Amino acid sequence: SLRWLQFGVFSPINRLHSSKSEFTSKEPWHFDAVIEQSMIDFLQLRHQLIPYLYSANLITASEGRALVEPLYYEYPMEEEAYQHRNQYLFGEQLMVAPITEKMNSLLQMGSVEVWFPEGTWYDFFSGQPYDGKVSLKVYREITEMPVFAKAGAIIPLDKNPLKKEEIPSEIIWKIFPGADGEYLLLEEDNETKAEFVNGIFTVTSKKESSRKHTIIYGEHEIVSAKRGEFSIDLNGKEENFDWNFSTALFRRLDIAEISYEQKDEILQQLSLIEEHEKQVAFIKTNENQELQNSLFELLYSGK
Amino acid sequence: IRAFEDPYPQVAQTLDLNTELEEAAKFDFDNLKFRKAYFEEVHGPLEKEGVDFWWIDWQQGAISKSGVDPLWLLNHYQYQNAQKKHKNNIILSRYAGPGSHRYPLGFSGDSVISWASLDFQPYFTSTASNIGYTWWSHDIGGHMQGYKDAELSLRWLQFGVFSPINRLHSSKSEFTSKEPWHFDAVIEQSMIDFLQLRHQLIPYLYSANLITASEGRALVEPLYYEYPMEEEAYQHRNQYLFGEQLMVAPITEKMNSLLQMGSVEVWFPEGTWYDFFSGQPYDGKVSLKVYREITEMPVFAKAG
Amino acid sequence: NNIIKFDKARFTVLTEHLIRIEYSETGEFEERMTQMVQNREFSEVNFDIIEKEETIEIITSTVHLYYNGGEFTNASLFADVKFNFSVYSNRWYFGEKSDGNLKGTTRTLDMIDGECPLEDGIMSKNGFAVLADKGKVLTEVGDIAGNSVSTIDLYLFAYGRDYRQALKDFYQLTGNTPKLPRFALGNWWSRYYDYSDKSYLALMDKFTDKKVPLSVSVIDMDWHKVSEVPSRFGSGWTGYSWNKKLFPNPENFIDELHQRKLKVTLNDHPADGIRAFEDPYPQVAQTLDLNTELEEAAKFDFDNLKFRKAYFEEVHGPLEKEGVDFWWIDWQQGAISKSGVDPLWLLNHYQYQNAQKKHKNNIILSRYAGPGSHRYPLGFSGDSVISWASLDFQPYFTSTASNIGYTWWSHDIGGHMQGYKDAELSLRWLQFGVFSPINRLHSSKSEFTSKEPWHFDAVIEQSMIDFLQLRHQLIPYLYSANLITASEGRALVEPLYYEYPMEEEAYQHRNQYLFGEQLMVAPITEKMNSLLQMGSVEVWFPEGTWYDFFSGQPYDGKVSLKVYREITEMPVFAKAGAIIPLDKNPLKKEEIPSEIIWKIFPGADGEYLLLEEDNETKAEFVNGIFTVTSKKESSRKHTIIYGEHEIVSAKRGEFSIDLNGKEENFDWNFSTALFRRLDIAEISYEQKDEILQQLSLIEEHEKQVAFIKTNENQELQNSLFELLYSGK
Numbered sequence A: 001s002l003r004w005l006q007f008g009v010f011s012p013i014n015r016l017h018s019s020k021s022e023f024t025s026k027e028p029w030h031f032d033a034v035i036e037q038s039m040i041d042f043l044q045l046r047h048q049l050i051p052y053l054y055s056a057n058l059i060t061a062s063e064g065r066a067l068v069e070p071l072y073y074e075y076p077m078e079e080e081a082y083q084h085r086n087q088y089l090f091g092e093q094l095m096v097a098p099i100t101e102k103m104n105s106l107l108q109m110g111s112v113e114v115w116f117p118e119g120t121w122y123d124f125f126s127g128q129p130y131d132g133k134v135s136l137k138v139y140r141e142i143t144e145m146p147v148f149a150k151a152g153a154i155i156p157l158d159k160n161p162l163k164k165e166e167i168p169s170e171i172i173w174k175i176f177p178g179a180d181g182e183y184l185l186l187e188e189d190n191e192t193k194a195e196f197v198n199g200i201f202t203v204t205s206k207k208e209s210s211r212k213h214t215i216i217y218g219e220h221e222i223v224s225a226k227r228g229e230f231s232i233d234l235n236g237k238e239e240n241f242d243w244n245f246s247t248a249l250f251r252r253l254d255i256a257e258i259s260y261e262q263k264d265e266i267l268q269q270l271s272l273i274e275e276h277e278k279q280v281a282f283i284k285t286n287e288n289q290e291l292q293n294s295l296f297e298l299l300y301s302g303k
Numbered sequence B: 001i002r003a004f005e006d007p008y009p010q011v012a013q014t015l016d017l018n019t020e021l022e023e024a025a026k027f028d029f030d031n032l033k034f035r036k037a038y039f040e041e042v043h044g045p046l047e048k049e050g051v052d053f054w055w056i057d058w059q060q061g062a063i064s065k066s067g068v069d070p071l072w073l074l075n076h077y078q079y080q081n082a083q084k085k086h087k088n089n090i091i092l093s094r095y096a097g098p099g100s101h102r103y104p105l106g107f108s109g110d111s112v113i114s115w116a117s118l119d120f121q122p123y124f125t126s127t128a129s130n131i132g133y134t135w136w137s138h139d140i141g142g143h144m145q146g147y148k149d150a151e152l153s154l155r156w157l158q159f160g161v162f163s164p165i166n167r168l169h170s171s172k173s174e175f176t177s178k179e180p181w182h183f184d185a186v187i188e189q190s191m192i193d194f195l196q197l198r199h200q201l202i203p204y205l206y207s208a209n210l211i212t213a214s215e216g217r218a219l220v221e222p223l224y225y226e227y228p229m230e231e232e233a234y235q236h237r238n239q240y241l242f243g244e245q246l247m248v249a250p251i252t253e254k255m256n257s258l259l260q261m262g263s264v265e266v267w268f269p270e271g272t273w274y275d276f277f278s279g280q281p282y283d284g285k286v287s288l289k290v291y292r293e294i295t296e297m298p299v300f301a302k303a304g
Numbered sequence C: 001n002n003i004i005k006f007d008k009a010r011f012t013v014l015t016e017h018l019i020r021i022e023y024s025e026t027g028e029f030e031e032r033m034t035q036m037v038q039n040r041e042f043s044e045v046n047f048d049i050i051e052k053e054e055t056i057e058i059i060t061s062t063v064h065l066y067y068n069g070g071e072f073t074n075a076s077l078f079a080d081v082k083f084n085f086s087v088y089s090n091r092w093y094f095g096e097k098s099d100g101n102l103k104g105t106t107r108t109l110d111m112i113d114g115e116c117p118l119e120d121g122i123m124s125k126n127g128f129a130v131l132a133d134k135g136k137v138l139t140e141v142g143d144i145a146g147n148s149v150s151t152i153d154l155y156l157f158a159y160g161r162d163y164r165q166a167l168k169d170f171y172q173l174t175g176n177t178p179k180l181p182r183f184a185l186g187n188w189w190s191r192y193y194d195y196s197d198k199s200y201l202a203l204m205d206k207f208t209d210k211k212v213p214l215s216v217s218v219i220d221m222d223w224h225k226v227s228e229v230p231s232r233f234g235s236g237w238t239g240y241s242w243n244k245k246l247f248p249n250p251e252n253f254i255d256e257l258h259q260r261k262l263k264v265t266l267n268d269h270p271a272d273g274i275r276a277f278e279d280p281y282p283q284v285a286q287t288l289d290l291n292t293e294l295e296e297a298a299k300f301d302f303d304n305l306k307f308r309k310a311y312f313e314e315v316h317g318p319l320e321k322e323g324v325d326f327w328w329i330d331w332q333q334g335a336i337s338k339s340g341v342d343p344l345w346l347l348n349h350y351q352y353q354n355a356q357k358k359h360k361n362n363i364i365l366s367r368y369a370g371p372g373s374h375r376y377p378l379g380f381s382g383d384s385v386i387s388w389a390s391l392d393f394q395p396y397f398t399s400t401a402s403n404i405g406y407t408w409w410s411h412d413i414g415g416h417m418q419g420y421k422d423a424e425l426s427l428r429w430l431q432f433g434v435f436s437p438i439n440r441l442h443s444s445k446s447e448f449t450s451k452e453p454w455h456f457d458a459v460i461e462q463s464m465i466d467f468l469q470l471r472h473q474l475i476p477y478l479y480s481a482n483l484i485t486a487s488e489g490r491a492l493v494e495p496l497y498y499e500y501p502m503e504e505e506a507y508q509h510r511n512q513y514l515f516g517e518q519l520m521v522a523p524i525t526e527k528m529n530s531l532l533q534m535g536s537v538e539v540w541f542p543e544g545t546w547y548d549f550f551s552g553q554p555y556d557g558k559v560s561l562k563v564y565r566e567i568t569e570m571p572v573f574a575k576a577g578a579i580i581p582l583d584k585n586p587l588k589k590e591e592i593p594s595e596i597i598w599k600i601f602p603g604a605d606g607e608y609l610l611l612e613e614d615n616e617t618k619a620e621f622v623n624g625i626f627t628v629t630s631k632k633e634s635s636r637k638h639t640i641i642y643g644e645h646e647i648v649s650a651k652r653g654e655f656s657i658d659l660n661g662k663e664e665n666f667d668w669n670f671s672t673a674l675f676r677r678l679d680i681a682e683i684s685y686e687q688k689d690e691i692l693q694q695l696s697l698i699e700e701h702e703k704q705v706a707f708i709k710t711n712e713n714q715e716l717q718n719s720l721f722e723l724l725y726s727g728k
């Protein structure tokens, strides 16, 4: 039910529905506290995405571009773009690889094989980095979805998803460091251009308005509730996400339903072995094949 | 007490040791002067800093010149010495044979973390009453090695709350903490609820403690103590009487994923029984498989 | 000085790490040698004593040994080591076992299919071991004298993880291993088969035709009467009388083997003694005054001086006169004797002594007879079951034996009896055998178990012939190591933990070993994966740069890496700067090589000392300069191979050559190796094509590894990973 909702949020329309059974309600509070909270978080995220969704709607209607695109629309000459049936582009800034198989109980994580095009990619939620071009098995807890953004991506989010407003009074601009980027937010009665060029972020609009703009640069909120058109130099600011190998490794070993002797040995050897190639050699000896692939994803992001 | 230790100068003077050769005060509990140095000059300064009682952690065998197990010498003499610190003081140490119940508490040590270890422990604990050793303190959730399973940790804590002592402990792993918040919101909340319940039960537990001491009745009784002529009382190894008012059937096997519930076969003696938590009723005498979510434990009370 | 008495005990501090402990009811302590101990003369060492009325403590650099008086008990006699290898296994108690012992060996592999228990050795991960001396005392000249007056006699070893020094001082205490003769280090031929003189000589000539060198010709029990023995005598198992239908002129047959430069040994089953149908019986019956009309047997009795003398002079004597060079003592009839001395120990002790009258540095072939019996090489492990499990045990069994100083185990290469046919098992076993102390092919009485290479298909036969030639190329290296065992107490075969005592991985690769000082061996002891058409073993590479000795495939240490080989290749490695001498002429019958190849592994300095019968030759590699010198001059011609290329051919005398200009790199390359492994693999052609294309196209090493990580064949992932690791 939770994986299906994760997909629905990153689908054209997010309509919860069920047949006549007393037992098939999609109410988040039908489920346990963990599932309930994750469902509520995703349902709030859908409303946060409405500006991005409404803009892409106006693009479909005016320029004949689909919100959801097969990978081969953007990468028609890459063979891997035809080999990831459930992977897609979601508007122009986001790439989605939904987890659609039950978790491996030994890992306490589900997984999907992701194709990362040439470029630097970040997990939209965690900032975990990936060097494209590569095909890589990625693992997530049942509460986390594989959604990626390129260096230079700019995504607008409604800052007030619960407040009943015909158009957002406040937009968060979420920026992924490491390249130039551009987002055009089309609305009922405006257009707003966010530009990021040699570390300069500039917002302009065809019409003035009372809208207040929040800017998040990688990890850090730089500007809260700033009105009107402006420019800010982000060259001074920390470009790096907090995501780190050591923290992620500890979490994956800690949730895994494996032997404590194996957890201890993996934590000790990956902490002690400095050379990346010898860390990979160490995980290649592990008898649990899916555990190897999970540890490999962390070592590949951390390379 | 070896030559690097803080108390060594004082012990070396007391026992006439050659300090330039770094002569150790070797463990010798057969020796009156060694024991006196151990209690007065080694434990003494640590008790003056505020140590209330001693966890004697002996795993080095049964060899002495007297032929007396050093574990028995430690438990006997340290229990006696503990009464100078505090009225009705305790130790925490392994079982030293029949009569060593005079030196509570029992400490069962380095269990492997497994469903198997949990499934043995209620039987182990009630069976110990048959040699009068009624205060076993097990590492709740298991000590070492074994496998991670948050459900196992939660079932183990349910049992510990309805055991003689509820001591959370783990080995040296970064991964084996028994903190409730180590686990997900569901497991964490249930663990917190069970830990609160242990303190709710202290009046009951403390009253039963006075009964053990004055009347020779175990807190944890095998079913056959109350029902000696009932064959079913010999066929439910993990089922027990917990004081005089409660019957416990801990769940000690992983849940059936299709039901999202664990189960145990309970024998209900003649009479009307209720689930202590839910009020679910049961007409005895019957043997019935009972099912609980991982957050719920089978504990029963009779009408009245 | 180094002797302290207290109560009824005596303590001798032989080294800072070695203490003799004795108890005596009579106040007399034992000075005589024992079956085990040959020498208690050691240089004075420093230690401290705390002696009180009722207690003594002896303190060395590595142990506190305590005695509280009275009879030795676990409470009265104990010791703490001055190490922290364990949290609480650092105490020895008299008569108690502690954990950490790395084991030693056992009498035999008779009837063992896979693993069997071993006795304790003198080596422990926790730093101490006790070696009980339960043997009889010897006379000056080495005869059994009777019971020790030291009714308890123990050696406490407290060497920590200085395993090499423990073994050195054990050899000082128990006597060094004698020198082997060079002939023992070549290939032996053996088979429990009723050869005639003609059929045996035809086989030796077939070995020559097939380019397989041999040093020893074993003749098993069918040399003597078997089925002809009248049943009133018992069986034909014991025999001292030639079957004259098979060997009508024994002395001529043995001269024929001698003319082929082969040493000859006969199987001896001693246990039924010399019975009345035997050819030597009239002479033995005269000497021992037996009742010949009642057919009184000379029953086996090695406690008896007159029996031993009759056995040596009147039974072995005539066979040795016919040309028998040395004795295969094949005892499987138990440990019972009036003296309480194991008949196997008496045989090994006395036959090894007697064998020295025949030849300088002569040998026997016999089962292990307990601590000190390394004085009577060679070891014979006996009737192993022909199985993968038995081969998988054998490397571990062999290196572990060094922990009780028994360094010359000769296993039946390819296993002895029963079990199952598998040509690949036979080939893997020979690979190990070649890199073992002794390479003796042998088999039980089956028509189907010959170890002849031509028993097998063309691929297996050629590989077997190649490995059998390699054994003879290795005799210089083996002989030099043999002189090092005899002179310095260093085993040819060492467990990894002798060199790397502090590396946990040195305890985790049971079948991996150092073979002399220049080579590290990881034999494959499991059947191949048919999908890969390769077998594999997990290898621990210590820090440093390693090369496959055969291929020059490189490995950056420290790493644990699964390595894959076709059934025709063995994992043997050498470090940067390794120098290994090879006989250039393994098939030529020379008493010492006329020509040595010097194989140099580039990338560091190195040094090798080739010890011989009447020379020492030093090879030095310092800043790209290779230099050969010798204690004595000789006609010897030296060939130098530096990495891939022959630099100097057939150069005489001492000399120095600059190799700084020459190619250091081996040809071994990723692309060639990748193609070979994909090509032999029994996998889909679509997978082979895709792997070849992607690993060629993807340039970044980490993305090549990411590509192989997606492969659904887990073992193919590991095989491709080994290549990428070597190619990083």
Ligand SMILES: OC[C@@H](O)[C@H](O)[C@@H](O)CO
Residues within 6 Å of the ligand: B057, B109, B110, B143, B169, B170, B171
């Ligand atoms: O002091 C460390 C010990 O291993 C303890 O943690 C055990 O609980 C003793 O049984």
Ligand SMILES: OC[C@@H](O)[C@H](O)[C@@H](O)CO
Residues within 6 Å of the ligand: C191, C192, C220, C221, C267, C330, C382, C383, C416, C442, C443, C444
């Ligand atoms: O003499 C026949 C024996 O069976 C030998 O072949 C064995 O190798 C002895 O162990």
